[PDB]
Amino acid sequence: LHKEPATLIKAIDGDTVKLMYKGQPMTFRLLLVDTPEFNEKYGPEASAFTKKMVENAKKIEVEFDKGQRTDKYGRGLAYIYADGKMVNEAAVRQGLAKVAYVYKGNNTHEQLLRKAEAQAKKEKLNIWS
Numbered sequence: 639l640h641k642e643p644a645t646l647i648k649a650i651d652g653d654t655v656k657l658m659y660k661g662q663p664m665t666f667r668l669l670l671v672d673t674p675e676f677n678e679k680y681g682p683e684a685s686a687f688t689k690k691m692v693e694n695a696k697k698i699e700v701e702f703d704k705g706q707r708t709d710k711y712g713r714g715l716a717y718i719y720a721d722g723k724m725v726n727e728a729a730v731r732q733g734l735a736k737v738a739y740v741y742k743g744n745n746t747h748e749q750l751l752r753k754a755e756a757q758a759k760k761e762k763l764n765i766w767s
């Protein structure tokens with residue numbers, strides 16, 4: 639896989655962000671994770687986490703997997719990096735996202751994320767508390 643440039647347009651919630659990608663605004667949904675909705679438990683904390691990560695970043699990058707690049711709602715499906723750190727992984731490592739939506743052939747980073755979830759679970763963090 640390869641990293642491509644993007645710039646933040648706006649934080650949305652724990653697992654969606656609006657970015658400019660190839661000069662066009664698009665909403666990106668984070669591959670392989672699920673954060674609580676804002677109205678749910680840890681929803682606000684997940685939103686805040688992702689928002690701080692993407693807003694504080696000097697460099698945002700998107701990385702498409704091998705398969706489908708847009709979902710049925712038109713959202714970009716990608717791994718999102720903030721100054722080199724994967725947002726998807728980081729949210730799972732903090733116990734603010736579960737590994738989820740693991741579809742065949744867009745699952746390159748599944749094992750990396752499951753390892754983070756295991757460590758989050760062990761620490762009894764947030765969702766796992």
Ligand SMILES: Cc1cn([C@H]2C[C@H](OP(=O)(O)O)[C@@H](COP(=O)(O)O)O2)c(=O)[nH]c1=O
Pocket residue numbers: 667668669670671672709710715739741744
């Ligand atoms: C993360 C991801 C979500 N989706 C679709 C599945 C779910 O469909 P449904 O809307 O029918 O439940 C939805 C969940 O996204 P959200 O967790 O953002 O609601 O997005 C994909 O199709 N591919 C993906 O990789």
Ligand SMILES: [Ca+2]
Pocket residue numbers: 653672673674675
């Ligand atoms: Ca969600």
